Structure 1
């Protein structure tokens, strides 16, 4: 197997994790299981704690910073760790029993169970014009040394790392998302009928989207060209609320539809951060520099669910538009963008770009 690890500035403490991206379904959220490597001597009476903070921050770009003008803690989990507290139990995973057996007796576990209805790692990077500042929800994991819970943590024998809560939806049976609209122009009842659909409801980053477009032109006019697009919507709903709208895929085609005839065709679009990096105003599931970052996924939410608490709500839509020679006639279908998915330690730091 493969495990990521990071040590405190003074290599006296070291965290070990088997993933840096935890996949949350709807039912459950993959458990966050790891272990710390301690120096019992180096710390007399001092202890080892590990906590999991989940918070929304606005201003600078990473929670652990001193330039953000707003912050709301959405979750906190503290754990007693070096001094094994019989109180604070666990069964123990098996990347653990394994790990502990390769690190020794100074190896200590910890486990976090992230509630299911918490927002997932989403980051929105405002661009050049946009008057808003950066913001996002991050999951900080920290293991530090101290006597009491309260003494003062020091950026030295302490370690922090951002993990990620990524959303996975399985794709059900259901009907393909459809949309249609009829249009009658001035001086005539002859209609121009538009109707589109997507091959499915759920897609994953990198996965192509097929759009079945059908056009029934009873009109005496002509459809010059057709434009297909995929747009993202990001609603920052906490400190300073605002709504960002941004196209992540377009595909205009000079397809013609003559008077009194029926048209038909299948278009293929691919929303991607790569062909959008540049762009800014959109929501991502991480930082840009970080390779391994995608477009923010669709914020799932429920009945009687608190929207503000989610931080940034993200959604996608496919828009079909006919330019009729005007008032183009158009429809839009909504879809859900989701996430896919001998030891030998490896750094934790996320791989970079170019």
Structure 2
């Protein structure tokens, strides 16, 4: 759906073909668009188009430009390169005051992520925004580099994480426990079907409990936890359960059990959207859980602003022996990556 935005003084209008731009690790879809100007109003002026990736935190406020690119589209510079089908269409259709622009993403950026704090959280609101801006600027004998608000337009865009071609090794885990006063172990092996999952895709967690203890494994709980780490400006940490299933089955003393439970991590699983890393405005409707942060090798993690990750957590609730006051709970975790399907 081709969408446009006109400036207040109607001098600079900007057209884009889409709002979501696909990052699939291998490459990122460039921002190809067009700018229709009113030659009467932009006469003697210059019109630029900019791409900005900013991390914001927060009145108290912090902002870091994770990436910035800018080009002049009027008057023309003559170095635009080959035009795309969308650009050619829009130019041939809108008239002659139409000037194409192409703004590429680098490979060291994160994707669109927003985070609003919950009452039990000490962190402030933060996120990563992507913004395209077309503006007209000019100088005079009294002022230079004057950019009036009326001669400019902004468009918020999305940068969406999609699965790359390859994929990590099969997620596996193994934890063993020896409790107080007994060298008898409780072993727990956990495997996932694959290392990358898609938003909405069922996640098969295979759980193998080898219980050599005199204790009873009263409960087997499997969660999908979203761990999020703000890594710029303030060191905030969040961890929320976004999916949960129990086994409805126990493991008696000196017993073994292997079962498969299927978790689907969805934002719709909890009405509470706060304290969770999302991929859009916390009140919109197509907002999903943020995709796993894919940190490219050699890059310093802090330039991602917000690190998002997902893990399967297997919790075992074991019974107390004679003399013990309460039950006990042990747990293990196995990481995995969540994102949108391949292009």
Task: Judge conservation of contact 1:194–1:329 (CA < 8 Å) in 2.
Answer: no
What corresponds to 1:80 in structure 2? Answer: 72
Match of 1:273 among 258, 267, 274: 267
Give, in whole Å, the separation in 1 of the partners of 2:169 and 2:54: 37
Q: Give the secondary-structure state (helix, strand or coil) at the position aligned to 1:211.
A: strand
Q: 1:319 Cα deviation (Å)? A: 0.2
What corresponds to 1:21 in structure 2? Answer: 20
Give unmatched runs, 5+ long, in structure 1. 60-66, 342-354
Cα shift readout 1:47-72 (whole Å, capped 9, x = no counterpart): 2211111111111xxxxxxx552111
What corresponds to 1:206 in structure 2? Answer: 200
Normalised to the residue count of structure 1, the TM-score between the two structures is: 0.88
Q: 1:103 Cα deviation (Å)? A: 1.0
Task: Tell me if 1:184 matches 2:145.
Answer: no
Cα shift readout 1:137-170 (whole Å, capped 9, x = no counterpart): 1111000112259633333221101111222223
Task: Judge conservation of contact 1:9–1:158 (CA < 8 Å) in 2.
Answer: yes
Give, in whole Å, the separation in 2 of the partners of 1:328 and 1:105: 70
Normalised to the residue count of structure 2, the TM-score between the two structures is: 0.90
Give, in whole Å, the separation in 1 of the partners of 2:157 and 2:104: 13
What corresponds to 1:232 in structure 2? Answer: 226
Cα shift readout 1:197-219 (whole Å, capped 9, x = no counterpart): 11110012112211111112232
What corresponds to 2:156 in structure 1? Answer: 162
Task: Judge conservation of contact 1:194–1:330 (CA < 8 Å) in 2.
Answer: no
Match of 2:252 among 249, 253, 258: 258
Task: Judge conservation of contact 2:218–2:250 (CA < 8 Å) in 1.
Answer: yes
What corresponds to 1:106 in structure 2? Answer: 97
Cα shift readout 1:165-206 (whole Å, capped 9, x = no counterpart): 222223636542111112233443333221111111001211
> Closer, same or farther in 2 for the Cα pair 1:313/1:159, shift >3 Å?
same
Task: Judge conservation of contact 2:132–2:155 (CA < 8 Å) in 1.
Answer: yes
Which sits farther off after the overlay, 222-231 or 189-198?
189-198
What corresponds to 1:130 in structure 2? Answer: 121
Give, in whole Å, the separation in 1 of the partners of 2:91 and 2:35: 9
| Count of aligned pairs | 332
> Closer, same or farther in 2 for the Cα pair 1:173/1:35, shift >3 Å?
closer
What corresponds to 1:56 in structure 2? Answer: 55
Task: Judge conservation of contact 2:167–2:196 (CA < 8 Å) in 1.
Answer: no
RMSD of Structure 2 on Structure 1 (CA): 2.0
Task: Judge conservation of contact 1:229–1:318 (CA < 8 Å) in 2.
Answer: yes
What corresponds to 2:322 in structure 1? Answer: none
Give, in whole Å, the separation in 2 of the partners of 1:333 and 1:90: 47
Q: 1:291 Cα deviation (Å)? A: 2.4
What corresponds to 1:333 in structure 2? Answer: 334
Task: Tell me if 1:90 matches 2:90.
Answer: no
Q: 1:277 Cα deviation (Å)? A: 4.6
What corresponds to 1:41 in structure 2? Answer: 40
Task: Judge conservation of contact 2:54–2:64 (CA < 8 Å) in 1.
Answer: yes
